[PDB]
Design a protein around this nucleic acid. Structure first.
Lengths: 89, 61, 54
RNA sequence: UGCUUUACUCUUUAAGGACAAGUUGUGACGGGGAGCGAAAUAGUAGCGAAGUUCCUGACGUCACACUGCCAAGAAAAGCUUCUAGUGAGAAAACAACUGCCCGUACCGUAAACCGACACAGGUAGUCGAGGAGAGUAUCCUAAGGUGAGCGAGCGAACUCU
RNA sequence: GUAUGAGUAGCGAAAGACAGGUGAGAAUCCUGUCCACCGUAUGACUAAGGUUUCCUGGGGAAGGCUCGUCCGCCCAGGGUUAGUCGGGACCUAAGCCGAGGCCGAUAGGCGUAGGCGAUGGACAACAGGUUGAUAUUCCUGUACCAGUUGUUUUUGUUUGA
RNA sequence: AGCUGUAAGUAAGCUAUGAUCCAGAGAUUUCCGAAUGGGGGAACCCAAUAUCUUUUAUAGGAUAUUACUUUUCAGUGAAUACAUAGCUGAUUAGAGGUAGACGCAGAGAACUGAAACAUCUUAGUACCUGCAGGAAGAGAAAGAAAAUUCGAUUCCCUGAGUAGCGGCGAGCGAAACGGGAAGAGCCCAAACCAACAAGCUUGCUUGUUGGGGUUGUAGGACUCCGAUAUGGUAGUCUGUUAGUAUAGUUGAAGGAUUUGGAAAAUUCCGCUAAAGAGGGUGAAAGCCCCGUAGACGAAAUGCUGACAACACCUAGGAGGAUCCUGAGUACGGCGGAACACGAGAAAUUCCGUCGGAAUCCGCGGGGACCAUCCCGCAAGGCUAAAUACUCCCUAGUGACCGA
């Protein structure tokens, strides 16, 4: 489907340091591979090689009103480049 | 606004679906960077995709 | 020795009395024999009761 | 032509074959370092001397290597050949690219595991320094880490050590 | 639900003292100084097991056998990057499931071929630096394995290629 | 004419082009689970074959198919020649869940009672297991009776705690006549006649169709005449209309004063009723609201009837030479169960084993057995209603409960 891979960019305090070395932090959906993220980024922003990295997240608790319940799963994606930028963000 | 959608040949249907996918992706990224007074434009894009897919299932018998 | 290929004979149970009518539980089984017969032209081996070998 | 095996003739301090810890260079103009130390919120950023000789020396490694004993001491794949075999022609060389899924925080002789507890109990494996010392024994100590989650006074009986 | 016992028994093995902080409040929080305890362990790394307790900034109603400005507690954000590590895309031992099949009132029981199954085999990366938390994963330097394109010394698939 | 659930907050929006909402039809529907490509510690991992894709190319992505068994047909096929195992492909059906309920079967306890306990009872109950259906089961006399008879089954009252059974102890316990509910009867096998095939005994033997035929007063074949009509259905997911179920529309009539924070309370004077059931509103309302009586209404999808079509199915009378009328069946011995009936003087029904009949001049039954009389045709099938239950859906009711 090639366009529902990436959801959001991760804007955090480590990620702003990663913006210096052309490294970007996205939230990729589950059941996705490294190679799809290459293909989706390259067909979404005209950028290139130098492999993605992919994490996972275990959920947590919150207790708003005496009702215990989890949060989601996640999957980050930390993508490095060769020669371009994404000065949108 | 479905009357506009039933007028169109099957190629232009697919072109409008691809344009709606691109606009939905840009609305996601503009949510994440803290923008967009218009947040209720998102339902329009999803439901327009839904209406186009139901119409393309209808004219495919 | 489970059932008959032809009739409906099969094992069952019933009582057992002895001279002052105490009751236990038996198994009364049919006489059964393995005979080589002809099913549909092809020879087969199957259990056949000794009653239906007359 | 691989492999097994019988019968005969040579050869043996040999020749051939197989394995092998660990040494010297390069890797390495590099980072590593006792101490000095700022311009500002910093022992920070930044700056560096020497790599010597003798003694003791490992069941760690060669390696289940060697000798002895009887209680006589797992499998299958990866690997190497030889043919059956399908069956243009790849085979070195250099350059440039490709390499998927899951676990990686933290505690882990414990306040985070098993004991209802922030419990004098239990928890498999590896490293485990010095003086004396056979030694991981005992007494005091290095690297390190701790000072116990109620106290202040008095200094009787009585009970415990 | 509330009394009596009764403001009694107990506060779960250990060495602290002073100065200066912060603060409405301090033996019990932070900083400094000396003293003291273990040191085949009260030190370092890991396998299970636990499942966010870890890091940063705030809070004191309840938990902490007292106190508490503090915490493994509460609120709010944020951290767990791999061709080489361990497991899968490789192999099997105990055991289990077992097409057909052999038995058996139904239910079902037992087993060939084939499989599943690590505690065992076989298998390509080392040194340093970096952060508030990750580091054989990030970057710095030098490597290795399996391949794909682009260039560079041979044809009867006979096969000696 | 307001709207964006629970539910406050703000941000953004939508609607007279009729939103939100209500009703009937559609479309989409991730992953696990009988789980079905292979594996598995469920919501995970790894494949094969075709086709389309990104990249110069390999790795990458998508779609469809690939379990097992039998029932039908192909092709392939050998220990062994002939064909049978076997293999491969296509085809048909199954496989699991409930509603903790009602039904039919297989297998089947103990405490307890007898003031102990063995036969007996608890009790063919609880539990397990297979099989279904909206109901199931049984069903058209080898019957009930005993004069004068009656004609499929099931369910209810009565017979009656009677006749009976029982260490004749504790106890167990019917049936027929009689009155009601509801009503319904059908189809094969056999003998015989052709057409096919094989053996062509070229005897007429077997198999396949088509006819024929279904009974006790015996009936049918077979012959002879006839007639060649009449009449019913438990059938179609065929039509045309009627009704109904799933959203709805309309629907009468009151003011003022006093006490009130607030009136529906109170007091004068009125009105309505095919509506004086109920609920809400600032305290108790026929006249404030939602409704009730009454009248009206379905584009769409079911469901029920009616009558058209279409499918079926069905004849008289006489003759009595010959032929047919359900076989290892009925029945007997031996061992057990069912019937109220515990082997007792024990028929009638099954089950296991071993013996083993007749063919209308025949056979079975009338509570051992014989003779006479009477009533009936077994060993092949199908069958609506009258009856039992409620996970659920709608509309209600209660000298039922009120933390």
């Amino acid at each position: 489907e090639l366009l529902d891979v990436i959801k959001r960019p991760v804007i955090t305090e480590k990620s702003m340091l990663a913006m210096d070395e052309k490294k970007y932090t996205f939230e990729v959906d589950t059941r996705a591979n490294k190679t799809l993220v290459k293909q989706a980024v390259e067909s979404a922003f005209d950028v290139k090689v130098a492999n993605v990295n992919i994490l996972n997240v275990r959920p947590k608790f919150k207790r708003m009103g005496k009702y215990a319940g989890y949060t989601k799963k996640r999957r980050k994606a930390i993508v490095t480049l060769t020669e371009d930028s994404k000065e949108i963000q | 606004k479905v009357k506009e959608i039933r007028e169109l040949t099957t190629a232009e249907m697919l072109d409008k679906e691809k344009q709606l996918k691109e606009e939905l992706f840009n609305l996601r990224f503009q949510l994440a960077t803290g923008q967009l007074e218009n947040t209720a434009r998102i339902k329009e894009v999803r439901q327009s995709i839904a209406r186009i897919k139901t119409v393309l299932r209808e004219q495919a018998n | 020795a489970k059932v008959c290929y032809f009739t409906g004979r099969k094992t069952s149970s019933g009582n057992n009395r002895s001279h002052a009518m105490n009751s236990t539980k038996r198994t009364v089984k049919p006489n059964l024999q393995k005979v080589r017969v002809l099913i549909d032209g092809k020879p087969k081996k199957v259990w056949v009761s000794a009653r239906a070998l007359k």
